[PDB]
Paper text:
The serine palmitoyltransferase ([name]) complex catalyzes the first and rate-limiting step in sphingolipid biosynthesis in all eukaryotes. ORM/ORMDL proteins are negative regulators of [name] that respond to cellular sphingolipid levels. We determined the cryo–electron microscopy structure of Arabidopsis [name]-[name] complex, composed of [name], [name], SPTssa, and [name], in an inhibited state. The [name]-[name] complex is a ceramide sensor in the ER that controls cellular sphingolipid homeostasis.
All the variants, including [name]-[name], designed to weaken the coordination of ceramide polar head, and [name]-S67R, [name]-W20R, and [name]-W88R, designed to repel ceramide aliphatic chains, exhibited greatly increased enzymatic activity compared to the wild-type (WT) [name]-[name] complex, supporting the importance of ceramide binding residues for [name]-dependent [name] repression. The overall structure of the [name]-[name] variant is essentially identical to that of the WT [name]-[name] complex, except for two apparent local structural differences. As anticipated, the density corresponding to ceramide greatly diminished in the [name]-[name] variant, confirming the largely disrupted ceramide binding by the mutation. The other evident structural difference is that the density corresponding to the [name] N terminus (residues 1 to 11, referred to as [name]-N11) mostly disappeared without forming the hybrid β sheet in the [name]-[name] variant, probably because of the flexible nature of the [name] N terminus in the absence of ceramide. The flexible [name] N terminus might not be able to suppress the acyl-CoA substrate entry efficiently, thus largely releasing the [name]-dependent [name] inhibition at saturating substrate concentrations. Our results suggest that ceramide binding could induce the formation of a hybrid β sheet between the N termini of [name] and [name], thus stabilizing the [name] N terminus in an inhibitory conformation that blocks substrate binding. The WT [name]-[name] complex represents a ceramide-bound state and has a decreased Vmax and an increased Khalf for palmitoyl-CoA compared to the ceramide-binding variant [name]-[name] ([name]-[name]), indicating that the ceramide binding can repress [name]-[name] by mixed inhibition.
Residue numbers in the entry:
A (entry chain E): 36 to 62
B (entry chain C): 1 to 47
C (entry chain D): 12 to 149
D (entry chain B): 1 to 36, 43 to 48, 53 to 475
E (entry chain A): 63 to 480
The structure:
């Protein structure tokens, strides 16, 4: 089943792209 | 110094193939020739 | 600046390409040197690359330069990129490349088997490596 | 700041990738064949890069620095590992060592006086400057530097790098900040560390950006405790070498008097070269020599000697004289070098009689301007401003460095090429540096040679003319 | 977040500290500007003092061979080299001097540095990185303890010239880092200390180094050419095969009467150092006349052993005279050429005692013409070894001036300190 993996990964790229940069925290 | 000579040398130094030792240079040299062979024969059959 | 010779070079015009161009080149050469189908070449490519990058980034801890004594004594290269400003554009590209590689290298061999299992594993580990949460954590 | 042609960038990345790849192969088979009481200190980068190019560095010479000096030939024996400078030597053109005003040879005024002072006081003395290292010559030196730089006091050291590394800890410490500049000397960086001061960085003399960092930093209170800091010091350099570019003084000074920050000038390369009289950048750019609180310089690149000095408010000099480690502990500056500095300043100020030293500046102006304009015309990529006597040509590839340096050497012209670790990845310079001792004929010859080599190596990146 | 309007005031009612604390009064005390060669009997202010603060143990200042060699080199070379050794700073005399030093001590290869303090600091940071372990000595002068700070390693001090504490510290270190087993372990020591003037015992340091796989970095600048039976160094003194030590450093300011220093060791070390130091790849090189003087001085030392012996007797004699001093007491080793005098029964705050020492030295110079040197610490020097006045006895001192020195010292000290 090609379709399921391709669709899941497409929304995966969407998720990774749409996010935003952020610093790590201090103590 | 001839045209071809000049070209060889210039290309040699651009791709960083100057400082390798002879055998490294040899090996790398060949590869491009193999590549070309492959391509033209393939192109011939594909067209 | 980024004030780090070992990680600042991933910012001048062109890096992104080079990369693709090298992989393209790899494909070409491998299939040419010995007869293979494109799918085999892409899998050969994917695993080659798996090995190559996974080792470097995710196991090379430190820096080669003696400029700073040891100030990054233990941090994989991937932990030093963009000075730990998690999920920047460069990081997104380095994450994106394995996904496209997996998709095409599996497709062109339209999920048969040996190859498919191998690459499943591959992409998996590489993506696992990254991940914002996973940082300085064994 | 630099125009990188696309295909040049791609070629540079590909070539470096190919070196890292052969490197790896070699290293791994070495290792495996090796495997078929104190820990070892030692590899990759150095071995690979330096061994592939090590006949282009540490070339021994057998004469005084001049316009034409002789270079020792060097054979390698058992395959390219230890070059052993044999006998037999050449006769080049000196485009390496900097000595702008041409003071490192033997003229008439300075050398007899230096020899006489050596005979009187003999080589070096044997103590520090607090106990028995203070001879009359040192006092004369301090007065001369005070009267030549402008500021009300000075102290002279024996080494510039030591000067910075031992002075930066004294002025700033734990709870202070150092907004340095992106590229400086390593000694300044070291100096920073020598104390407990945080080190921030702005972007090569774009004062706008300095302004933003400054405001921001001042808000942000301290690091993560939010106290206010107690000092802020801004370290800049007169003419930034290996980039050619000169510094934006008036802008920086007004921004540093905005937010009450302190200034720390570093006029090493630009204390004998630039100036209608030869005073530095504080004369060229018309900045009053009271808005800077510390000036450090170096007698090496212009006076043909070996030292270093600090000038500033008369309070700061007493504080350093009573608390600077490289004043209490180190041995004083040798006497002959002290009197050569005295003699050179007397020549520049025109205090020796005839007008010999009044035209050395004229000579350097013509030489530098003509050489830079001609290199621009021929199609090269010389960087920098218009009247600083450094003009790094730019190469961009690793293999271009041996080709260019070896070709120039064969046609009897000596240059200085700078590699990867000392630069960023792409930027690979080869920095020329003019003197007021080269004649017109020598510059014409070097222009012909560099043109031929640039034609044969393809480094005429900008369009020709 | 903040607004751009708000940042304006926060950047307005902040006010920084002055660049320097206000000058007090102690600070101004001038050194004795003197006008001659700073030999044994120099001259200052037109008077004729007897110098005791110049560190030329062998008395090579003013020698004529150094004069002629420096004259010839100065005539044919100039006064400067004008470039760092990496590009075009290597004159032939530099390589000749390196070969000469290596032949002297006995070692594969050597290296030269442009300044004395430089050696210490560059060397230590080149040899220990973030994770190493260093067992220092608590008496190391500023040059050494700046390099110790620059190389961000783990420093563990032990008592001044105490071998029991050295053994205890070594055993504790072995206990602490048993698991991980890769770190290198150095032991930074010093042949003859500037702050105390006592000789390190190298036999026992070697024995404890063998049992625990450590490494030594010895700074023998006050022993090279003065201490040994022939001038080779501390190794002669305590007679140990000289490759036991791993790094040997010296500064040529003292005995050779030139400037700069060297760093001797085996090939590996040396090449490493050479290509990736910091005070070597970035700084200018020695002016060639200094290197010429250095070679001449080395051969003069090598071919004239009589002065070495003479020096030892001279120090002996000085000890003999100062033996009976009431207020303050000798605390240096019987052989070393630094007659350290430590005051007894300290009055109180160290500032008062140090001012007492400065007053004593000034009075000595003003009344008896006899330059001496009273220990001085910055606020960056972390030594806690007692203050005192040092005496750099040399081989060019007569008996009469020496004798007189004791006399004056005695008198002044007793009366003013009681
Ligand atoms: C050239 C240069 C030096 C060299 O110092 P020396 O001690 O004379 O070798 C030091 N600092 C800076 C900033 C320089 O440009």
């Amino acid at each position: 089943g090609h379709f399921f993996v391709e669709g899941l990964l497409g929304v995966v790229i969407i998720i990774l792209l749409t996010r935003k940069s952020y610093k790590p925290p201090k103590r | 110094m001839n045209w071809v000579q000049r070209k060889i040398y210039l290309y040699n130094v651009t791709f960083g193939l100057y400082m390798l030792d002879w055998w490294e240079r040899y090996l790398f040299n060949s590869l491009v020739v193999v590549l070309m062979w492959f391509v033209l024969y393939n192109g011939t059959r594909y067209f | 600046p980024d004030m780090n010779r070992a990680t600042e070079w991933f910012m001048y015009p062109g890096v992104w390409t080079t990369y693709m161009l090298i992989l393209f080149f790899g494909w070409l050469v491998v299939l040419s040197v010995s007869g293979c189908s494109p799918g085999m070449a892409w899998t050969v490519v994917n695993l080659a690359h798996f090995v190559v990058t996974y080792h470097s980034f995710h196991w090379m801890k430190g820096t080669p330069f003696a400029d700073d004594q040891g100030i990054y004594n233990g941090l994989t290269w991937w932990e030093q990129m963009d000075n730990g400003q998690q999920l920047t554009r460069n990081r997104k590209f380095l994450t994106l490349v394995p996904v496209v590689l997996y998709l095409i290298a599996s497709h062109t061999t339209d999920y048969r088997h040996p190859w498919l299992f191998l690459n499943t594993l591959a992409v998996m580990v590489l993506v696992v490596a990254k991940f914002p949460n996973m940082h300085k954590v064994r | 700041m630099i125009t990188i042609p696309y295909l040049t960038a791609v070629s540079t990345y590909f070539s470096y990738g190919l070196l890292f790849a052969f490197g790896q192969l070699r290293d791994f088979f070495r290792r495996f064949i090796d495997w078929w009481g104190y820990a070892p200190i030692c590899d990759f980068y150095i071995r690979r890069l330096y061994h592939r190019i090590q006949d282009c560095f540490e070339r021994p010479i057998s004469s005084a620095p001049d316009a034409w000096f002789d270079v020792v030939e060097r054979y390698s024996n058992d395959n390219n590992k230890t070059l052993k400078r044999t006998t037999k030597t050449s006769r080049c053109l000196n485009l390496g060592s900097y000595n702008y005003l041409g003071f490192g040879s033997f003229d008439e005024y300075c050398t007899p006086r230096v020899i006489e002072s050596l005979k009187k006081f003999s080589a070096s003395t044997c103590s520090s400057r607090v106990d028995a290292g203070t001879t009359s010559v040192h006092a004369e030196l301090e007065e001369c530097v005070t009267r030549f730089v402008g500021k009300p006091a000075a102290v002279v050291f024996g080494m510039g790098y030591a000067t910075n590394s031992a002075i930066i800890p004294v002025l700033i410490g734990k709870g202070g900040l150092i907004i340095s500049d992106s590229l400086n000397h390593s000694s300044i960086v070291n100096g920073a560390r020598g104390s407990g001061a945080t080190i921030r960085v702005f972007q090569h003399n774009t004062p706008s950006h300095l302004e933003r960092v400054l405001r921001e930093q001042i808000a942000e209170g301290q690091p993560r405790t939010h106290r206010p800091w107690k000092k802020i010091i801004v370290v800049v350099e007169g003419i930034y070498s290996m980039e050619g570019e000169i510094c934006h003084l008036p802008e920086v000074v007004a921004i540093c008097k905005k937010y009450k920050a302190y200034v720390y000038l570093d006029e090493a390369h630009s204390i004998g070269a630039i100036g209608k009289t030869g005073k530095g950048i504080c004369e060229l750019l018309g900045v009053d020599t009271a808005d800077v609180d510390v000036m450090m310089g170096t007698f090496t690149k212009s006076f043909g000697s070996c030292g270093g000095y600090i000038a500033g408010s008369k309070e700061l000099i007493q504080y350093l004289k009573h608390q600077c480690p490289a004043h209490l502990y180190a041995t004083s500056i040798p006497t002959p070098s002290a009197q050569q500095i005295i003699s050179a300043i007397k020549v520049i100020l025109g205090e020796d009689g005839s007008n010999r030293g009044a035209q050395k500046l004229a000579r350097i102006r013509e030489n530098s301007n003509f050489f830079r304009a001609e290199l621009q015309k021929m199609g090269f990529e010389v960087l920098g401003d218009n009247d600083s006597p450094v003009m790094p040509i730019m190469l961009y590839n690793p293999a271009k460095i041996p080709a260019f340096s070896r070709e120039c050497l064969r046609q009897k012209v000596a240059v200085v090429v700078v590699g990867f670790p000392a630069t960023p990845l792409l930027l690979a310079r080869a920095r020329i540096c003019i003197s007021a001792s080269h004649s017109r004929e020598d510059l014409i010859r070097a222009l012909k040679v560099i043109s031929k080599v640039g034609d044969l190596s393809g480094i005429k990146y900008f369009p020709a003319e | 977040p903040l607004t751009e309007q708000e940042i304006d005031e926060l950047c307005d009612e902040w006010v920084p500290e002055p660049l320097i604390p206000p000058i007090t009064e102690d600070m101004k005390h001038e050194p004795p500007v003197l006008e001659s060669a700073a030999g044994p009997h120099t001259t200052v202010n037109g008077k004729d003092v007897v110098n005791f603060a110049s560190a030329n143990y062998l008395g090579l200042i003013g020698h004529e061979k150094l004069l002629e060699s420096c004259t010839s080199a100065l005539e044919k070379y100039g006064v400067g080299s004008c470039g760092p050794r990496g590009f075009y700073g290597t004159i032939d005399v530099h390589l000749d001097c390196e070969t000469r030093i290596s032949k002297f001590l006995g070692t594969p290869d050597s290296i030269l540095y442009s300044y004395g303090l430089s050696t210490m600091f560059s060397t230590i940071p080149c040899f220990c990185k973030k994770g190493d372990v260093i067992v220092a000595d608590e008496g190391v002068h500023w040059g050494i303890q700046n390099g110790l700070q620059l190389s961000r390693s783990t420093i563990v001090y032990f008592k001044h010239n105490d071998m029991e504490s050295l053994r205890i510290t070594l055993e504790k270190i072995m206990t602490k880092y048993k698991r991980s087993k890769n770190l290198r372990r150095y032991i930074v020591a010093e042949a003859v200390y500037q702050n105390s003037g006592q000789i390190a015992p190298l036999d026992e340091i070697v024995k404890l180094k063998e049992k625990y796989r450590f490494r030594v970095i010895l700074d023998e600048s006050n022993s090279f050419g003065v201490l040994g039976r022939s001038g080779r160094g501390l190794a002669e003194h305590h007679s140990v095969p000289i490759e036991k030590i791993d790094v040997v450093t010296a500064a040529m300011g003292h005995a050779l009467a030139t400037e700069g220093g060297f760093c001797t060791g085996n090939a590996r070390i040396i090449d490493y150092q050479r290509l990736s130091s910091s005070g070597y790849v970035f700084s200018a090189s020695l002016p060639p006349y200094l290197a010429s003087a250095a070679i001449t001085a080395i051969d003069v030392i090598d071919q004239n052993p009589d002065m070495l012996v003479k020096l030892k007797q001279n120090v002996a004699l000085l000890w003999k005279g100062l033996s009976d001093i009431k207020g303050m007491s000798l605390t240096s080793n019987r052989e070393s050429p630094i007659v350290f005098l430590k005051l007894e029964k300290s009055s109180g705050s160290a500032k008062d005692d140090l001012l007492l020492l400065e007053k004593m030295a000034d009075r000595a110079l003003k009344e008896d013409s006899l330059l001496v040197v009273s220990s001085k610490r910055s606020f960056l020097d972390k030594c806690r070894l007692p203050v005192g006045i040092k005496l750099y006895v040399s081989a060019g001192h007569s008996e009469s001036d020496l004798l007189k020195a004791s006399e004056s010292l005695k008198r002044l000290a007793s009366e003013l300190l009681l």
